[PDB]
Amino acid sequence: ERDCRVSSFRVKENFDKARFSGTWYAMAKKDPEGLFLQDNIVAEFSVDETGQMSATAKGRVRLLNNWDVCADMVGTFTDTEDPAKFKMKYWGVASFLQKGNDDHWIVDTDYDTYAVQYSCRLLNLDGTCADSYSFVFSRDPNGLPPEAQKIVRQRQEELCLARQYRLIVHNGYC
């Protein structure tokens, strides 16, 4: 029944930045081709007076051949016609870490407990994603409440990414 084509994905109606700001702990990730950001990923989102969102991040990274650092990132959200969809230009502090420009969309959030972010870097000829990534976000490093857990799972399914995610640990690396 449900569609798997990008342009169909729902997003957070009336997305509010302000409300969003703050610390978010990554509980689950759905890796894209060429994984970066391993685990212990904590993100600190903000917005300045203009209405411009931005954020930093931090987590383990597994460089080539086993060499794991504690990266520190920087993103800067470029709006779009739709409130929940942003163009995110990111880069790390160390000129050697990864740089890019990725679509960042807020699929769903309640602002105070969980969030579900989505990103599709390369579409297929059929409209489905050929290279995507997801983040389940939790305002608490211990998990979300059974109630939040439920919509979140509902959400992972609407993105046709269910049971594709993987638990994100916070064992204290960073």
mmCIF file of all heavy atoms in Angstrom, residues 1 4-5 8 21 23 25 29 39 46 50 58 62 82 85 95 104 112-113 115 118 122 130 136 139 141 173:
data_model
loop_
_atom_site.group_PDB
_atom_site.id
_atom_site.type_symbol
_atom_site.label_atom_id
_atom_site.label_comp_id
_atom_site.label_asym_id
_atom_site.label_seq_id
_atom_site.Cartn_x
_atom_site.Cartn_y
_atom_site.Cartn_z
ATOM 1 N N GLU A 1 0.816 -1.200 0.000
ATOM 2 C CA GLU A 1 0.000 0.000 0.000
ATOM 3 C C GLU A 1 0.853 1.255 0.000
ATOM 4 O O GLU A 1 0.879 1.999 -0.983
ATOM 5 C CB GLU A 1 -1.018 0.034 1.159
ATOM 6 C CG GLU A 1 -2.397 0.599 0.756
ATOM 7 C CD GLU A 1 -2.532 2.092 0.909
ATOM 8 O OE1 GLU A 1 -2.820 2.644 1.957
ATOM 9 O OE2 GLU A 1 -2.372 2.733 -0.220
ATOM 10 N N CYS A 4 6.886 4.499 -1.508
ATOM 11 C CA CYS A 4 8.269 4.588 -1.121
ATOM 12 C C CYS A 4 9.028 5.672 -1.852
ATOM 13 O O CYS A 4 10.246 5.737 -1.770
ATOM 14 C CB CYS A 4 8.987 3.248 -1.248
ATOM 15 S SG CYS A 4 8.854 2.165 0.189
ATOM 16 N N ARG A 5 8.297 6.529 -2.553
ATOM 17 C CA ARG A 5 8.876 7.625 -3.304
ATOM 18 C C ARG A 5 9.016 8.896 -2.476
ATOM 19 O O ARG A 5 8.050 9.390 -1.885
ATOM 20 C CB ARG A 5 8.019 7.943 -4.518
ATOM 21 C CG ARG A 5 8.137 6.976 -5.687
ATOM 22 C CD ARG A 5 7.031 7.304 -6.680
ATOM 23 N NE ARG A 5 5.967 8.007 -5.974
ATOM 24 C CZ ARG A 5 4.722 7.976 -6.403
ATOM 25 N NH1 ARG A 5 4.522 7.276 -7.511
ATOM 26 N NH2 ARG A 5 3.715 8.598 -5.787
ATOM 27 N N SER A 8 6.770 11.845 -1.482
ATOM 28 C CA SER A 8 5.601 11.435 -0.735
ATOM 29 C C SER A 8 5.780 11.487 0.760
ATOM 30 O O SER A 8 4.803 11.630 1.487
ATOM 31 C CB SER A 8 5.155 10.049 -1.166
ATOM 32 O OG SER A 8 5.449 9.093 -0.162
ATOM 33 N N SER A 21 15.605 23.686 18.928
ATOM 34 C CA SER A 21 16.892 23.997 19.518
ATOM 35 C C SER A 21 17.214 23.181 20.746
ATOM 36 O O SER A 21 16.342 22.684 21.449
ATOM 37 C CB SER A 21 16.930 25.446 19.935
ATOM 38 O OG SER A 21 16.014 26.166 19.141
ATOM 39 N N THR A 23 19.879 20.316 22.867
ATOM 40 C CA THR A 23 20.595 19.069 22.843
ATOM 41 C C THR A 23 19.695 17.900 22.517
ATOM 42 O O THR A 23 18.613 17.783 23.086
ATOM 43 C CB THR A 23 21.303 18.859 24.178
ATOM 44 O OG1 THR A 23 22.140 19.973 24.440
ATOM 45 C CG2 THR A 23 22.115 17.572 24.119
ATOM 46 N N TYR A 25 20.249 13.599 21.507
ATOM 47 C CA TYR A 25 21.073 12.408 21.576
ATOM 48 C C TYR A 25 20.631 11.416 20.518
ATOM 49 O O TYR A 25 19.467 11.050 20.403
ATOM 50 C CB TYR A 25 21.009 11.711 22.950
ATOM 51 C CG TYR A 25 21.579 12.585 24.028
ATOM 52 C CD1 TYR A 25 20.779 13.543 24.655
ATOM 53 C CD2 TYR A 25 22.913 12.464 24.417
ATOM 54 C CE1 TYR A 25 21.298 14.361 25.657
ATOM 55 C CE2 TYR A 25 23.449 13.278 25.414
ATOM 56 C CZ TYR A 25 22.633 14.226 26.031
ATOM 57 O OH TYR A 25 23.146 15.030 27.013
ATOM 58 N N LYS A 29 20.421 5.077 14.149
ATOM 59 C CA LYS A 29 20.884 5.518 12.860
ATOM 60 C C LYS A 29 20.724 4.427 11.819
ATOM 61 O O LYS A 29 20.882 3.249 12.134
ATOM 62 C CB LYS A 29 22.360 5.890 12.949
ATOM 63 C CG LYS A 29 22.778 7.002 11.998
ATOM 64 C CD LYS A 29 24.239 7.004 11.583
ATOM 65 C CE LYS A 29 25.189 6.537 12.672
ATOM 66 N NZ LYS A 29 26.281 5.706 12.149
ATOM 67 N N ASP A 39 29.084 6.123 16.575
ATOM 68 C CA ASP A 39 28.251 6.068 17.776
ATOM 69 C C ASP A 39 28.607 7.170 18.768
ATOM 70 O O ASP A 39 29.647 7.798 18.618
ATOM 71 C CB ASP A 39 28.478 4.719 18.478
ATOM 72 C CG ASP A 39 29.937 4.368 18.544
ATOM 73 O OD1 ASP A 39 30.692 5.345 18.998
ATOM 74 O OD2 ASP A 39 30.362 3.289 18.174
ATOM 75 N N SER A 46 20.802 24.893 17.226
ATOM 76 C CA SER A 46 20.542 26.282 17.548
ATOM 77 C C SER A 46 20.092 27.090 16.348
ATOM 78 O O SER A 46 20.072 26.596 15.224
ATOM 79 C CB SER A 46 21.840 26.958 17.959
ATOM 80 O OG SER A 46 22.691 26.046 18.619
ATOM 81 N N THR A 50 17.344 35.717 13.089
ATOM 82 C CA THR A 50 17.188 35.939 11.667
ATOM 83 C C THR A 50 16.155 34.913 11.292
ATOM 84 O O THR A 50 15.210 35.103 10.528
ATOM 85 C CB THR A 50 18.407 35.494 10.846
ATOM 86 O OG1 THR A 50 19.272 34.672 11.591
ATOM 87 C CG2 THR A 50 19.120 36.642 10.151
ATOM 88 N N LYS A 58 28.907 15.654 17.359
ATOM 89 C CA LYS A 58 30.120 15.032 17.828
ATOM 90 C C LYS A 58 29.940 13.551 18.097
ATOM 91 O O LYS A 58 28.970 13.156 18.727
ATOM 92 C CB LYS A 58 30.585 15.700 19.097
ATOM 93 C CG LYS A 58 31.199 14.658 20.012
ATOM 94 C CD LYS A 58 30.745 14.847 21.451
ATOM 95 C CE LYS A 58 31.895 14.945 22.442
ATOM 96 N NZ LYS A 58 33.196 15.211 21.810
ATOM 97 N N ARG A 62 35.024 6.036 12.316
ATOM 98 C CA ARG A 62 35.969 4.973 12.061
ATOM 99 C C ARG A 62 36.659 5.274 10.758
ATOM 100 O O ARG A 62 36.138 4.929 9.702
ATOM 101 C CB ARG A 62 35.373 3.573 12.035
ATOM 102 C CG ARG A 62 36.465 2.514 11.886
ATOM 103 C CD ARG A 62 35.947 1.084 11.746
ATOM 104 N NE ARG A 62 35.637 0.419 13.014
ATOM 105 C CZ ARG A 62 36.369 0.443 14.131
ATOM 106 N NH1 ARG A 62 37.514 1.114 14.225
ATOM 107 N NH2 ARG A 62 35.936 -0.227 15.199
ATOM 108 N N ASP A 82 9.669 24.646 2.080
ATOM 109 C CA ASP A 82 8.940 23.942 3.086
ATOM 110 C C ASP A 82 9.706 23.901 4.389
ATOM 111 O O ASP A 82 10.867 23.511 4.447
ATOM 112 C CB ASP A 82 8.350 22.662 2.489
ATOM 113 C CG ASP A 82 8.238 21.461 3.369
ATOM 114 O OD1 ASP A 82 8.105 21.661 4.660
ATOM 115 O OD2 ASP A 82 8.211 20.380 2.876
ATOM 116 N N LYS A 85 11.861 21.187 5.547
ATOM 117 C CA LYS A 85 12.935 20.748 4.684
ATOM 118 C C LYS A 85 14.052 21.761 4.568
ATOM 119 O O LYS A 85 13.856 22.917 4.195
ATOM 120 C CB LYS A 85 12.485 20.298 3.307
ATOM 121 C CG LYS A 85 11.086 19.704 3.264
ATOM 122 C CD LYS A 85 10.905 18.847 2.018
ATOM 123 C CE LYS A 85 9.563 18.152 1.977
ATOM 124 N NZ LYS A 85 9.558 16.829 1.383
ATOM 125 N N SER A 95 40.027 20.265 8.660
ATOM 126 C CA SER A 95 39.920 20.324 7.214
ATOM 127 C C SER A 95 39.952 18.982 6.500
ATOM 128 O O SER A 95 39.589 18.894 5.323
ATOM 129 C CB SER A 95 40.874 21.325 6.588
ATOM 130 O OG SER A 95 42.143 21.220 7.201
ATOM 131 N N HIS A 104 18.214 17.969 4.579
ATOM 132 C CA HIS A 104 17.943 17.614 5.965
ATOM 133 C C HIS A 104 16.466 17.863 6.159
ATOM 134 O O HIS A 104 16.000 18.983 5.978
ATOM 135 C CB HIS A 104 18.740 18.471 6.977
ATOM 136 C CG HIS A 104 18.635 18.049 8.415
ATOM 137 N ND1 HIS A 104 19.685 17.413 9.074
ATOM 138 C CD2 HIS A 104 17.613 18.189 9.300
ATOM 139 C CE1 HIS A 104 19.283 17.177 10.316
ATOM 140 N NE2 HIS A 104 18.041 17.633 10.486
ATOM 141 N N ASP A 112 10.108 17.973 22.592
ATOM 142 C CA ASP A 112 10.612 17.680 23.916
ATOM 143 C C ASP A 112 11.125 16.263 24.175
ATOM 144 O O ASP A 112 11.747 16.031 25.201
ATOM 145 C CB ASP A 112 9.588 18.103 25.005
ATOM 146 C CG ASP A 112 8.355 18.861 24.557
ATOM 147 O OD1 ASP A 112 7.316 18.313 24.222
ATOM 148 O OD2 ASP A 112 8.452 20.169 24.692
ATOM 149 N N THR A 113 10.887 15.293 23.293
ATOM 150 C CA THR A 113 11.350 13.939 23.567
ATOM 151 C C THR A 113 12.133 13.240 22.477
ATOM 152 O O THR A 113 13.220 12.700 22.697
ATOM 153 C CB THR A 113 10.097 13.065 23.793
ATOM 154 O OG1 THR A 113 9.407 13.470 24.954
ATOM 155 C CG2 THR A 113 10.426 11.575 23.844
ATOM 156 N N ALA A 115 12.703 12.931 17.957
ATOM 157 C CA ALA A 115 12.827 13.445 16.628
ATOM 158 C C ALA A 115 13.211 12.340 15.686
ATOM 159 O O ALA A 115 13.807 11.340 16.071
ATOM 160 C CB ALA A 115 14.049 14.343 16.648
ATOM 161 N N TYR A 118 15.563 12.709 8.357
ATOM 162 C CA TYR A 118 15.704 11.911 7.151
ATOM 163 C C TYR A 118 16.577 12.560 6.102
ATOM 164 O O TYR A 118 16.589 13.770 5.944
ATOM 165 C CB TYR A 118 14.323 11.719 6.490
ATOM 166 C CG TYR A 118 14.348 10.915 5.208
ATOM 167 C CD1 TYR A 118 14.847 9.604 5.208
ATOM 168 C CD2 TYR A 118 13.874 11.437 4.012
ATOM 169 C CE1 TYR A 118 14.881 8.825 4.057
ATOM 170 C CE2 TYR A 118 13.910 10.670 2.840
ATOM 171 C CZ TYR A 118 14.404 9.371 2.862
ATOM 172 O OH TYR A 118 14.434 8.615 1.719
ATOM 173 N N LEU A 122 20.650 10.515 -3.019
ATOM 174 C CA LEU A 122 20.569 10.136 -4.408
ATOM 175 C C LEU A 122 19.309 9.362 -4.710
ATOM 176 O O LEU A 122 19.158 8.225 -4.241
ATOM 177 C CB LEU A 122 21.809 9.344 -4.838
ATOM 178 C CG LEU A 122 21.837 9.041 -6.334
ATOM 179 C CD1 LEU A 122 22.222 10.272 -7.164
ATOM 180 C CD2 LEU A 122 22.793 7.878 -6.588
ATOM 181 N N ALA A 130 17.818 6.136 -3.383
ATOM 182 C CA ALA A 130 18.871 5.212 -3.734
ATOM 183 C C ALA A 130 20.029 5.367 -2.780
ATOM 184 O O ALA A 130 21.015 4.646 -2.832
ATOM 185 C CB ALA A 130 19.366 5.565 -5.122
ATOM 186 N N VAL A 136 17.174 8.836 14.619
ATOM 187 C CA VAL A 136 16.060 8.860 15.535
ATOM 188 C C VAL A 136 16.659 9.723 16.635
ATOM 189 O O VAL A 136 17.762 9.428 17.106
ATOM 190 C CB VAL A 136 15.691 7.521 16.133
ATOM 191 C CG1 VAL A 136 14.743 7.829 17.280
ATOM 192 C CG2 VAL A 136 14.976 6.639 15.116
ATOM 193 N N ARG A 139 15.882 13.332 23.292
ATOM 194 C CA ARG A 139 16.222 14.361 24.230
ATOM 195 C C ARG A 139 16.854 13.728 25.478
ATOM 196 O O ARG A 139 17.396 14.440 26.314
ATOM 197 C CB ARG A 139 14.947 15.138 24.524
ATOM 198 C CG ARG A 139 15.110 16.646 24.484
ATOM 199 C CD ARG A 139 14.346 17.420 23.411
ATOM 200 N NE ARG A 139 15.335 18.392 22.962
ATOM 201 C CZ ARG A 139 15.284 19.520 22.267
ATOM 202 N NH1 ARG A 139 14.145 20.036 21.780
ATOM 203 N NH2 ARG A 139 16.439 20.147 22.064
ATOM 204 N N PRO A 141 19.592 10.620 26.939
ATOM 205 C CA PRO A 141 20.598 9.611 26.666
ATOM 206 C C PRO A 141 20.243 8.237 27.192
ATOM 207 O O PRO A 141 21.103 7.368 27.261
ATOM 208 C CB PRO A 141 21.859 10.034 27.419
ATOM 209 C CG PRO A 141 21.512 11.293 28.199
ATOM 210 C CD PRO A 141 20.190 11.792 27.639
ATOM 211 N N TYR A 173 32.666 7.402 24.609
ATOM 212 C CA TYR A 173 33.861 7.693 23.819
ATOM 213 C C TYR A 173 34.257 9.163 23.776
ATOM 214 O O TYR A 173 35.234 9.561 24.407
ATOM 215 C CB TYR A 173 34.013 7.042 22.420
ATOM 216 C CG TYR A 173 35.471 6.966 21.994
ATOM 217 C CD1 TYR A 173 36.155 5.747 22.041
ATOM 218 C CD2 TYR A 173 36.166 8.094 21.563
ATOM 219 C CE1 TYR A 173 37.494 5.646 21.668
ATOM 220 C CE2 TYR A 173 37.509 8.014 21.189
ATOM 221 C CZ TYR A 173 38.173 6.791 21.241
ATOM 222 O OH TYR A 173 39.491 6.702 20.874
#
